[PDB]
Amino acid sequence: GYDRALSIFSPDGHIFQVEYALEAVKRGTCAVGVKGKNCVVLGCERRSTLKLQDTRITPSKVSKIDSHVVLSFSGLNADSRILIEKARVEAQSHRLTLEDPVTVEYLTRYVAGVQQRYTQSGGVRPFGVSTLIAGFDPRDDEPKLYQTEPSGIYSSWSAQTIGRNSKTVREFLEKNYDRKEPPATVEECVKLTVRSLLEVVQTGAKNIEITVVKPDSDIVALSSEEINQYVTQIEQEKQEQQEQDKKKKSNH
Amino acid sequence: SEGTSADREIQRTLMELLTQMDGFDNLGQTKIIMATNRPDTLDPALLR
Amino acid sequence: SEYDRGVSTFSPEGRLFQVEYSLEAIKLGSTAIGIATKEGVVLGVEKRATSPLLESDSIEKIVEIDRHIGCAMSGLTADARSMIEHARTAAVTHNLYYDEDINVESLTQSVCDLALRFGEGASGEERLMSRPFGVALLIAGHDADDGYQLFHAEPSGTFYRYNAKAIGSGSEGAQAELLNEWHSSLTLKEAELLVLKILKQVMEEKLDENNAQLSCITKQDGFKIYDNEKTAELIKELKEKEAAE
Amino acid sequence: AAPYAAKLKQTENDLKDIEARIKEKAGVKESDTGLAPSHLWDIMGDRQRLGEEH
Amino acid sequence: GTGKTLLARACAAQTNATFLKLAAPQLVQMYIGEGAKLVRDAFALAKEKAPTIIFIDELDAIGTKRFDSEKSGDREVQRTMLELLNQLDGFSSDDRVKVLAATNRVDVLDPALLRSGRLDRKIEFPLPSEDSRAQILQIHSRKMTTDDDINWQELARSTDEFNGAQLKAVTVEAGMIALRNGQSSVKHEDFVEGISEVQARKSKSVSFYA
Amino acid sequence: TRCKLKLLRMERIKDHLLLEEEFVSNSEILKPFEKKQEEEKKQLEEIRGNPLSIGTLEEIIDDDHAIVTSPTMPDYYVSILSFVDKELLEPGCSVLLHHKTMSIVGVLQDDADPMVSVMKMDKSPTESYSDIGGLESQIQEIKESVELPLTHPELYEEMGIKPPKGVILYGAPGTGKTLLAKAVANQTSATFLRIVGSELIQKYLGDGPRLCRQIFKVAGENAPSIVFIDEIDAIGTKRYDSNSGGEREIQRTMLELLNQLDGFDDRGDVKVIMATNKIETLDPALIRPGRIDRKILFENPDLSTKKKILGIHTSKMNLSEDVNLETLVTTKDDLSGADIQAMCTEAGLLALRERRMQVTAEDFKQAKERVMKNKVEENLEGLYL
Amino acid sequence: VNGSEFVHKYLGEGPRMVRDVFRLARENAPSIIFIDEVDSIATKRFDAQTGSDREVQRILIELLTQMDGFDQSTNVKVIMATNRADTLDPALLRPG
Amino acid sequence: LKQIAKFVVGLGERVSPTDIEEGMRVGVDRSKYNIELPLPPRIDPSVTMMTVEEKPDVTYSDVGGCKDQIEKLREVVELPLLSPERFATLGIDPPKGILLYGPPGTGKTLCARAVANRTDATFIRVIGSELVQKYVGEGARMVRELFEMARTKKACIIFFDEIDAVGGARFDDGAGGDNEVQRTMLELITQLDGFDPRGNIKVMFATNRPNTLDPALLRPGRIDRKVEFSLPDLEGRANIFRIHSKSMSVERGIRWELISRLCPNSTGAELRSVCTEAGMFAIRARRKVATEKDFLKAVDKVISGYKKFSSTSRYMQYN
Amino acid sequence: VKDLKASQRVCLRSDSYMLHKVLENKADPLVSLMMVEKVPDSTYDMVGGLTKQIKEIKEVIELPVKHPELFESLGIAQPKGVILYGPPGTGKTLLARAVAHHTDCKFIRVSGAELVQKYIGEGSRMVRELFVMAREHAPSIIFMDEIDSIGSTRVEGSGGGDSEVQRTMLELLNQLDGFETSKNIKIIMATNRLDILDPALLRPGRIDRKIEFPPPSVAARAEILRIHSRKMNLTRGINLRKVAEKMNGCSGADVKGVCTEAGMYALRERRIHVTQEDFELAVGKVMNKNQETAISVAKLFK
Ligand SMILES: Nc1ncnc2c1ncn2[C@@H]1O[C@H](COP(=O)(O)OP(=O)(O)OP(=O)(O)O)[C@@H](O)[C@H]1O
Ligand SMILES: Nc1ncnc2c1ncn2[C@@H]1O[C@H](COP(=O)(O)OP(=O)(O)OP(=O)(O)O)[C@@H](O)[C@H]1O
Ligand SMILES: Nc1ncnc2c1ncn2[C@@H]1O[C@H](COP(=O)(O)OP(=O)(O)OP(=O)(O)O)[C@@H](O)[C@H]1O
Ligand SMILES: Nc1ncnc2c1ncn2[C@@H]1O[C@H](COP(=O)(O)OP(=O)(O)OP(=O)(O)O)[C@@H](O)[C@H]1O
Ligand SMILES: [Mg+2]
Ligand SMILES: [Mg+2]
Ligand SMILES: [Mg+2]
Ligand SMILES: [Mg+2]
């Protein structure tokens, strides 16, 4: 049995195609979401092969679904393309009908619905892709981050890690982050995302990509200069940290 | 190469049989007739 | 065994195996309890925090279907998305056609008719769902000519009326207690604290308001989903009640 | 590796000395099976054993 | 469980004859070169004081088709089995000495024993028919308590691919459930519950409509 | 030099001393007795005649006689004679027989077989942690199951629960699960059998399951013991095609192995270590528990683990002067412990070849690329990208 | 010898037969070893995972190592013939 | 002789013609061939003293639960031996055999040990690979001799544990004496058959697969009654944790009810392993009791390990 | 009895079975196996043309036996067993043969299967007997052929009667790695591919050194022609380097195949010299073979 289609329920009550989709997520690139209280930072790992691959004509892992909603992804690179396109045509159809900017909540349900559609029928597999969808609501400054899974279950998470070796980032993120007091300033928010991706990239600040989404439909993608500037400060404080345990131990 | 090994054991006996009737040629006075009773085996007799 | 892969497709006992297997999906899910009382039906649920980064009160396990029909859910929330939508449409078109608040009994049947599509082609209703659903509901409301009813929708398309019914992991244990704890003479404050007494015992973590979410159907208040401040107050009163004893 | 290599060479000599105990130890033994009070039965047993009915 | 053993024993009662029974693991005893004396000894007795039936049961290891499974003494046992058949052919009309044979699978049975008119007439006992099932339950029931509210036709329809062996167990089972409850008189209800405890299925498990 | 000398001084003097005293005393045993212990020796030598045959004791017969089975085909009717009493003998025990007229001498074989010599290990492994490079949690679990109940029963008393009856080790190839088992075997100070699981399998009717049964027989008597049976995918349930001899054999060995391990009151204090490499051929009635009472997954090293394996190995290699350890472990991804063991031996080798009396940076980096070739998968970024 | 006569009568019987045949050639050396059919014995590849298929392979592994020699035999090395040219190619034998 | 050469042998020195007859062991000279002294009857007590054993200390209350299956298993074996009165008056002769099947780790072994203790009659432990003791046809005389010894006693249980060897299945492709493998299987089944009606020679079989079982053997009236055993339902689980935890130190005002909701369907054996493992966590913590928390961990480890072999993953890793 | 040890063969006298003498000779089919094959007289010089292959096998196998000192100080542990791999026909058996001459240790070749011994029955647990007999006669340089060119699928198995030969394969590995004493046991393997290999023969501690023996270069091939001609009669006008460029072989044995064919022409005519023209005709015979194998990949492909 029982993983040979999506239409067998199995006596352990799992639809295998969804369970196996999750293991495909691992193949893609780390992606990390962290909300502040005036920003959401959405950052992802950028894979670098060789110098003969570009990063100009070559697609980033952060994609604009509109002008106030953003998306980063993990999964098969092929799968993700259609997932993003269909989500985008919905985002525009929403202004066509209502004439409103899309609601963050409305959008995430639409993308989870598409994966859910695929998952229910047996004529297709689902998109083997989990995404994190960041954005701000049409007029409120309340920061929103939601997550989707191949299953077509969405949740809201204040911070979440997906992609390659997600769990080891999750535990660090769980500790440092508070929902009692998220970062007040975009600058510390950005650096926390950097701290999370530091672990899994090892060398490079050209393997960390930062984009910020803020209210009033501002999305900006940050420069290699600024990211290198953030990673060096982390690198200096970390160097210092090692020295302090060495002193403190002698001192007591 | 996936048939029974039983038939393979008893194969050898016939190979001594087949070679033996040769001594009679080309005196045609003594002759040999053979009758099969299985389509399961294919005898090295049909071959030579 | 060797008779179980298809949904058509029997089975020396005579049962559809695919249909029975979806029963087992409901136990995977988080515990949900409902208790009908003559003052309203209380739908409490459990939520489970995998990380204390999953924002508890943005996951929805109680949802509004109309102003008088509510649902709680357990099982796959992938299957609950289509399941719920159907019923939200049912209540809204019924009000459109007849102006009357949908009857709870008929609202169940609409859910369960949709549950029935298994095949990929049949005579009669034309089947277009590729598998049985993987979600149960507790359906709660109040109609005007039969009072408060509490139903359980099954993904197998059968409906049992109940006085009280639990689904989820803690279904067996809750069900055992509620056999000793239902009465004709219970009241809605009493129901509310009844759900929490049963709930703490069948939750793996501990009873907090973050991991609880109760709600009521009262004719006066309509469908009211609570807050955590409200839910916390009730928790503090459960603990007082158990202290005396 | 002279400072410590010297001491290594002596360790192999020790291995042979322990081996020589295994041989030595076997050279004298003392054993006995049965119990001491069954000594009278041995005496009987020679008369039956010698004899032929078995 | 088609009732071969039964029918051969009975066959012998009718004709009032000298009945010798042999069974392929019984026949072989001690050193396997002493196995050949025993076949011969048996048939020496039989032909004298005729009529007779020599019935050889379950032949699945001294009448193997393969010659790969090693045997050197149990081979001589097959050969001395063969003399007997030969002397039936040796009488022309072999009225005096009748032989019967039984085996569980005839695919396992040796091909040279069937080959030619060395042994004649091969008789296949199928699964009981609906007709045959009705009769088989009744007879066994006689021995326990018997009630006529039991409709035996109802039972015969329900069972599919059942042997007489399997039905004796249903008759006995009907008695086990009945005693358990403490009803000193069997019902039809008990009997219907006896099909699904002899079979490995559970029909006792509530469903989504039960 | 001073540290070696200090150990060397004590162990040579005493051991050399114990040797010399055995020489003097051995003579000296003999003189006290000459008719006070001598008598039993004279009576045995005469009755035995020196040549003797074995028999197996079939049964006793009441009148001081017995019936025995010889290794030759006839049985014989013996009389019970000599010092050895018939409360020291029961059926199922081996007996010696006298040449001329077969007679019960006594027992001295004590059901010996040449397979007992094979079970019985005499070789002692290295091996303790601090030669085990990481896997802290994995070290811990095998110590609590196998080392601990024997050394400290106190904790098991206090709680009042039975001790683990085994453990099963499984994971990726070459992970060095073998060190941990060896480490358990050294530290305990317990009788360590084993065996390979490919040694119970033969081709001779019914000898195989009796060899399985024999291991437990020797362990239960010399309990507490630990038994390590390697490679259980040589004794799984797997297909066997047709026209094979081994199709029965594999079935019977496994069956006997199963009953003894569970017990019917069990040995009750013999723990087992099973190791294996294919869990898709393992039978289902040997990894359900009461048999084994943990099951543990081993996985290939990661950064912290690698640095430890590496860490021990480099300190036993001279002059790593310009060698940074951290920079190598960083780049390395998804390797076994086998591969890092190999990289130290290879890197030293390149240092020899360079005509250099010391290791370098560049000696290590070259060796590292070589062993990455060997263990590689690329369909992760092949599929993705 | 024949290829109908190089078969497995038992599991692992196939390779036993080869070793006897090439020892015997050495005993009576010089001698010419003739195999009539090596068209069933030699086949480039399989999509199989049974030891039934491995019996056929081990004849060829054995055939190769034995031909070769280590005694540097006074034999006139294996003469073989095949009706086909496309299952016994000069990439299974080869080149000399 | 036990040389298997045959002789006409002279007289003894006190032998009677009324003592030495067919089926009696006698001793003769080893080179002269004359009886002088006769020998005792039989020659099977060598194998039969070890196979029989006295009573283990397990009770039919652990055997876990209080299942319908346990009750019915007691009816087939124990009740008629104890009392045939009910059976004769109902008008049934008791089922002769009974099959113990179910996934391995269901505790058919708990059943074998328990029925021995209750019975107050002789219980023979027999392993299927202690009947294979071949020297070529010797293994068959083991089956025969052992069966015959039970049939001399009247009210007795023979129990075979995990037959699949001797009670195997048939081949048409076998090798090396796979006929003698069949001969030993078939030897058992015929003697069974033959004695019927026996009363009170009762056969139990534990099989880990009922399809590695001869189709001739499986045929009812060797094996008239068959009981299926299963993974205990939630209640049966709850009961069994309390037996084992009575023995351990635990928290007064703990929830065993909670541990069963958490645990999914699983082998009864592995249900026993929970309590042991929970205890392990209390042991390394140095705590002198076992919390509710550490049982939660103990289920989690066993289940999560087991999932590794069969069916992975959940959707409640984010949900 | 001190001059005796358990599992030491001992000779006996008459029918008393009084001990006579001690047998330090132990007669086994393991031994007869090696006895037909003898000590080989292939030398390194004949595999001359590639000396890199000869240089890595020397360092790993020979050098730690003769001088353990270096690797007990500078490195850690005796360098592990090698597996020879490369395209078919390169010279991988030839290399093993050559090494055997130069080391002067006891080899325990051991041909292409081990199921070739059925004098004590089939090796199911007598495979392990090999290690014991080797350990005594130490150094234990072992050579094994499991060429494994056939069966593109064979690694996914876990097995039918694959199991018998796998049980033989497996028990080798356990014994090798051992428990834990060693007497410098080294296993040279020769094999066709490592992609087409016996499952779990390499994993990867065993055997984690690897030696590649590549397809020869023209610079390599010229030397191979040179040495085969020194035994024979040289080319006239010394064009033996000149022909190397015209066709490159694809193996070391293809280089050999030119010379044998070339000197065959001299056999037809019965001349005492060879010439350039003989060498040229000879290359073309070797190419016929590359053509016979693949020809349909140029016509009726994709
Ligand atoms: N056709 C039948 N009519 C009456 N009873 C039957 C019949 N078939 C089977 N039985 C009952 O089942 C019991 C067991 O079947 P039985 O031993 O006769 O099988 P068989 O076909 O002769 O066996 P084998 O193939 O093992 O030699 C019989 O003793 C009888 O009580
Ligand atoms: N943690 C470690 N510390 C030191 N050496 C290591 C470590 N891990 C691996 N090794 C080295 O690599 C070898 C690889 O393990 P090995 O080949 O014995 O396999 P295994 O998976 O334990 O085998 P099997 O399934 O046959 O029991 C070890 O024996 C040791 O030499
Ligand atoms: N129902 C139960 N209650 C209590 N403990 C149990 C129960 N079932 C199993 N166990 C425990 O698990 C151990 C192992 O299971 P056991 O050996 O009894 O199984 P089985 O089904 O007879 O297996 P096999 O197929 O290997 O013969 C028992 O000794 C006992 O400790
Ligand atoms: N590199 C070489 N230098 C010189 N002669 C060579 C060289 N390689 C091979 N030879 C010669 O060519 C002969 C044939 O080698 P062949 O190609 O058949 O070898 P192999 O690699 O051992 O094969 P297999 O994989 O079939 O076991 C050798 O026996 C030797 O005489
Ligand atoms: Mg019959
Ligand atoms: Mg190991
Ligand atoms: Mg059992
Ligand atoms: Mg070769």
Side-chain angles (χ1 to χ4, degrees), chain F residues 73-74 100 141 144 159 162 170 210 213 243 251 255 259 264 288 293-294 297, chain H residues 2-3 30 105 125 127 129 133 162 164 173 209 249 276 280 284 301 308-309:
Chain F
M73 222 198 278
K100 172 176 74 59
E141 284 179 72
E144 185 181 12
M159 188 51 47
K162 71 165 184 55
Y170 62 92
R210 298 172 196 133
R213 198 179 296 106
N243 318 293
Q251 191 37 236
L255 191 154
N259 308 111
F264 289 124
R288 49 118 295 163
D293 267 283
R294 278 164 177 55
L297 188 80
Chain H
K2 298 301 188 313
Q3 198 193 320
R30 66 187 173 185
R125 183 71 73 208
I127 306 302
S129 291
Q133 293 294 322
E162 312 201 63
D164 297 288
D173 305 285
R209 288 173 311 246
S249 35
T276 304
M280 288 299 115
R284 69 188 82 172
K301 193 168 170 179
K308 304 173 180 280
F309 313 131

Coordinates of all heavy atoms in Angstrom, one line a residue, chain F residues 73-74 100 141 144 159 162 170 210 213 243 251 255 259 264 288 293-294 297, chain H residues 2-3 30 105 125 127 129 133 162 164 173 209 249 276 280 284 301 308-309:
Chain F
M73 N 27.3 -46.2 16.3 CA 25.9 -46.6 16.1 C 25.4 -47.4 17.2 O 24.3 -46.9 17.7 CB 25.7 -47.2 14.7 CG 24.4 -46.8 14.0 SD 23.9 -47.9 12.7 CE 25.0 -47.4 11.4
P74 N 25.9 -48.5 17.8 CA 25.3 -49.1 18.9 C 25.3 -48.4 20.2 O 26.3 -47.7 20.5 CB 25.9 -50.5 19.0 CG 27.2 -50.4 18.2 CD 26.8 -49.4 17.1
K100 N 37.6 -51.2 27.9 CA 37.5 -52.7 27.9 C 36.1 -53.1 28.1 O 35.6 -53.9 27.4 CB 38.5 -53.1 28.9 CG 38.4 -54.6 29.3 CD 39.5 -55.1 30.3 CE 39.1 -54.6 31.7 NZ 37.8 -55.2 32.1
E141 N 22.4 6.2 25.8 CA 21.4 5.2 25.8 C 21.8 3.8 25.9 O 21.2 3.0 26.6 CB 20.6 5.2 24.5 CG 19.6 6.4 24.4 CD 18.8 6.4 23.0 OE1 18.0 5.5 22.9 OE2 19.0 7.3 22.2
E144 N 22.9 3.2 29.5 CA 21.9 2.9 30.5 C 21.3 1.5 30.3 O 20.9 0.9 31.3 CB 20.9 4.0 30.4 CG 19.8 3.9 31.5 CD 18.8 5.1 31.1 OE1 18.9 5.7 30.0 OE2 17.9 5.3 32.0
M159 N 13.1 2.3 41.9 CA 11.9 2.4 41.0 C 11.2 1.1 41.1 O 10.0 1.1 41.3 CB 12.4 2.7 39.6 CG 11.3 3.0 38.7 SD 10.0 4.2 39.2 CE 11.1 5.5 39.8
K162 N 12.0 -3.8 36.0 CA 12.9 -4.8 35.3 C 13.9 -4.0 34.4 O 13.6 -2.9 33.9 CB 12.0 -5.7 34.4 CG 11.4 -5.2 33.1 CD 10.8 -6.1 32.0 CE 10.3 -5.3 30.8 NZ 11.3 -4.4 30.3
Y170 N 20.8 0.3 14.5 CA 20.6 0.4 13.0 C 20.7 1.7 12.5 O 20.5 2.7 13.3 CB 19.2 -0.2 12.6 CG 18.0 0.5 13.2 CD1 17.4 1.5 12.4 CD2 17.4 0.2 14.4 CE1 16.2 2.1 12.8 CE2 16.3 1.0 14.9 CZ 15.6 1.9 14.0 OH 14.5 2.5 14.4
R210 N 20.3 -25.6 16.4 CA 20.9 -26.0 17.6 C 22.1 -25.1 17.9 O 22.4 -24.8 19.1 CB 21.6 -27.4 17.5 CG 20.7 -28.6 17.1 CD 21.5 -29.9 16.8 NE 20.5 -30.9 16.1 CZ 20.9 -31.6 15.0 NH1 22.2 -31.7 14.7 NH2 19.9 -32.1 14.1
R213 N 20.7 -22.1 19.8 CA 20.3 -22.5 21.1 C 21.5 -22.5 22.0 O 21.6 -22.1 23.2 CB 19.8 -23.9 21.1 CG 18.9 -24.3 22.3 CD 18.3 -25.8 22.3 NE 17.4 -26.0 21.1 CZ 17.7 -26.7 20.0 NH1 18.8 -27.5 19.9 NH2 16.8 -26.7 18.9
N243 N 14.3 -24.3 -5.7 CA 15.4 -25.2 -6.1 C 16.7 -24.9 -5.3 O 17.8 -24.8 -5.8 CB 15.6 -25.5 -7.6 CG 14.2 -25.7 -8.3 OD1 13.6 -26.7 -8.0 ND2 13.7 -24.7 -9.2
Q251 N 14.7 -20.3 7.8 CA 13.3 -20.4 8.5 C 13.5 -21.0 9.8 O 13.0 -20.3 10.8 CB 12.4 -21.4 7.7 CG 11.0 -21.4 8.1 CD 10.3 -20.0 8.4 OE1 9.8 -20.0 9.6 NE2 10.3 -19.1 7.4
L255 N 13.6 -19.2 13.9 CA 12.5 -19.7 14.7 C 13.1 -20.0 16.1 O 12.4 -19.6 17.1 CB 11.8 -20.9 14.1 CG 10.4 -21.6 14.6 CD1 9.7 -22.3 13.5 CD2 10.7 -22.6 15.8
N259 N 12.5 -18.0 20.1 CA 12.0 -18.5 21.3 C 12.9 -18.3 22.6 O 12.4 -18.0 23.7 CB 11.6 -20.0 21.4 CG 10.6 -20.2 20.2 OD1 11.0 -20.9 19.3 ND2 9.4 -19.8 20.4
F264 N 10.9 -18.3 28.6 CA 9.6 -18.8 29.1 C 9.7 -18.5 30.5 O 8.7 -18.6 31.3 CB 9.3 -20.3 28.8 CG 9.1 -20.4 27.3 CD1 9.9 -21.3 26.7 CD2 8.2 -19.6 26.6 CE1 9.8 -21.4 25.2 CE2 8.1 -19.7 25.2 CZ 8.9 -20.6 24.6
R288 N 9.7 -5.8 17.4 CA 8.8 -5.8 18.6 C 9.5 -6.4 19.8 O 10.3 -7.4 19.6 CB 7.5 -6.6 18.2 CG 7.8 -8.0 17.6 CD 7.3 -9.3 18.4 NE 8.0 -9.4 19.7 CZ 7.5 -10.2 20.7 NH1 6.3 -10.6 20.6 NH2 8.2 -10.5 21.8
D293 N 14.5 -3.4 23.8 CA 13.6 -2.5 24.6 C 14.1 -1.2 24.5 O 13.7 -0.3 25.3 CB 13.8 -2.9 26.1 CG 12.8 -4.0 26.4 OD1 11.6 -3.7 26.7 OD2 13.2 -5.2 26.6
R294 N 15.1 -0.9 23.6 CA 15.2 0.3 22.9 C 15.4 -0.1 21.5 O 15.7 -1.1 21.1 CB 16.5 1.2 23.3 CG 16.4 1.9 24.5 CD 17.7 2.4 24.9 NE 17.6 3.3 26.1 CZ 17.0 3.0 27.3 NH1 16.5 1.8 27.6 NH2 17.1 4.0 28.3
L297 N 18.3 5.0 16.2 CA 18.7 5.3 14.9 C 20.0 6.0 15.0 O 20.1 6.9 15.8 CB 17.6 6.1 14.3 CG 17.8 6.5 12.7 CD1 17.4 5.4 11.7 CD2 17.0 7.7 12.3
Chain H
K2 N 21.2 -51.9 17.7 CA 21.3 -50.5 17.5 C 22.6 -50.3 16.6 O 23.1 -49.2 16.3 CB 21.6 -49.7 18.8 CG 20.4 -49.8 19.8 CD 19.0 -49.3 19.2 CE 17.8 -49.1 20.2 NZ 17.7 -50.3 21.0
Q3 N 23.0 -51.5 16.1 CA 23.9 -51.5 15.0 C 23.1 -51.6 13.6 O 23.6 -51.2 12.6 CB 24.9 -52.7 15.2 CG 26.2 -52.6 14.3 CD 26.9 -54.0 14.3 OE1 26.8 -54.6 15.4 NE2 27.3 -54.5 13.2
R30 N 27.9 -58.5 22.5 CA 28.3 -57.5 21.4 C 29.2 -58.1 20.5 O 29.8 -57.5 19.7 CB 29.1 -56.4 22.2 CG 30.5 -56.8 22.8 CD 31.1 -55.7 23.7 NE 32.3 -56.3 24.4 CZ 33.1 -55.6 25.3 NH1 33.1 -54.2 25.3 NH2 33.8 -56.2 26.2
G105 N 3.5 -9.9 19.4 CA 3.5 -8.8 20.4 C 2.1 -8.6 20.9 O 1.8 -7.4 21.2
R125 N 6.0 -28.1 27.0 CA 6.5 -27.0 26.2 C 7.3 -27.8 25.1 O 8.1 -28.7 25.4 CB 7.6 -26.0 26.9 CG 8.1 -24.8 26.0 CD 7.1 -23.7 25.7 NE 6.9 -22.9 27.1 CZ 5.7 -22.2 27.4 NH1 4.7 -22.1 26.4 NH2 5.5 -21.7 28.6
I127 N 9.1 -26.8 21.2 CA 9.5 -25.9 20.2 C 9.6 -26.7 18.9 O 9.9 -27.9 18.9 CB 10.8 -25.2 20.5 CG1 10.7 -24.5 21.9 CG2 11.1 -24.1 19.5 CD1 9.6 -23.5 22.1
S129 N 11.4 -26.5 16.5 CA 12.7 -26.7 15.9 C 13.5 -27.5 17.0 O 14.8 -27.6 16.9 CB 13.5 -25.5 15.6 OG 13.0 -24.7 14.6
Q133 N 15.6 -32.8 14.5 CA 16.7 -33.2 15.2 C 17.3 -34.3 14.3 O 17.8 -35.3 14.7 CB 16.5 -33.8 16.5 CG 16.0 -32.8 17.6 CD 17.0 -31.7 18.1 OE1 18.2 -32.1 18.1 NE2 16.6 -30.4 18.1
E162 N 5.4 -21.2 17.9 CA 5.7 -20.7 16.6 C 6.1 -21.7 15.6 O 7.1 -21.6 14.8 CB 6.7 -19.6 16.7 CG 6.5 -18.5 17.7 CD 7.3 -17.2 17.3 OE1 6.9 -16.7 16.2 OE2 8.2 -16.7 18.1
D164 N 6.3 -23.2 12.1 CA 6.5 -22.9 10.8 C 7.5 -23.8 10.2 O 7.8 -24.0 9.0 CB 7.1 -21.4 10.5 CG 6.2 -20.2 11.0 OD1 5.2 -20.0 10.4 OD2 6.4 -19.6 12.1
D173 N 9.5 -27.8 -5.3 CA 10.7 -27.3 -5.8 C 11.9 -27.5 -4.8 O 13.0 -27.0 -5.0 CB 10.6 -25.7 -6.1 CG 9.5 -25.2 -6.9 OD1 9.6 -25.4 -8.2 OD2 8.5 -24.6 -6.4
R209 N 2.3 -16.5 11.5 CA 1.8 -16.4 10.2 C 0.9 -17.5 10.0 O 1.4 -18.6 10.1 CB 2.8 -16.4 9.1 CG 3.8 -15.2 8.9 CD 4.9 -15.4 7.9 NE 5.5 -16.7 8.2 CZ 6.8 -16.8 8.6 NH1 7.5 -15.8 9.3 NH2 7.4 -18.0 8.4
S249 N 7.1 3.0 41.4 CA 6.7 4.1 42.2 C 6.2 5.2 41.2 O 6.8 5.5 40.2 CB 7.9 4.7 43.0 OG 9.1 4.7 42.3
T276 N 8.2 0.6 31.2 CA 9.6 0.3 31.5 C 10.3 1.5 31.2 O 11.2 2.0 31.9 CB 10.1 -0.8 30.7 OG1 9.3 -2.0 30.8 CG2 11.6 -1.1 31.0
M280 N 12.7 4.6 32.9 CA 14.1 4.8 32.6 C 14.3 6.3 32.8 O 15.4 6.7 33.3 CB 14.4 4.5 31.2 CG 14.6 3.0 30.8 SD 15.8 2.1 31.8 CE 14.7 1.0 32.7
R284 N 17.3 8.3 35.3 CA 18.4 9.2 35.0 C 18.2 10.5 35.5 O 19.1 11.2 35.8 CB 18.7 9.2 33.4 CG 17.6 9.8 32.6 CD 17.7 9.7 31.1 NE 17.1 8.4 30.7 CZ 16.8 8.0 29.5 NH1 17.4 8.8 28.4 NH2 16.1 6.9 29.2
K301 N 8.7 8.1 22.5 CA 10.0 7.5 22.0 C 9.7 6.2 21.2 O 10.2 5.9 20.1 CB 10.9 7.2 23.1 CG 12.4 6.8 22.8 CD 13.3 6.9 24.0 CE 14.7 6.3 23.6 NZ 15.6 6.4 24.8
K308 N 9.5 4.9 12.0 CA 10.7 5.0 11.2 C 10.6 3.8 10.2 O 10.9 4.0 9.1 CB 12.0 4.9 12.0 CG 12.2 6.0 13.0 CD 13.5 5.9 13.8 CE 13.7 7.0 14.8 NZ 14.2 8.3 14.1
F309 N 10.2 2.5 10.8 CA 10.1 1.4 9.9 C 9.0 1.3 8.9 O 9.2 1.0 7.7 CB 10.0 0.0 10.7 CG 11.0 -0.2 11.8 CD1 10.5 -0.6 13.1 CD2 12.3 0.0 11.6 CE1 11.4 -0.8 14.1 CE2 13.2 -0.1 12.6 CZ 12.8 -0.5 13.9

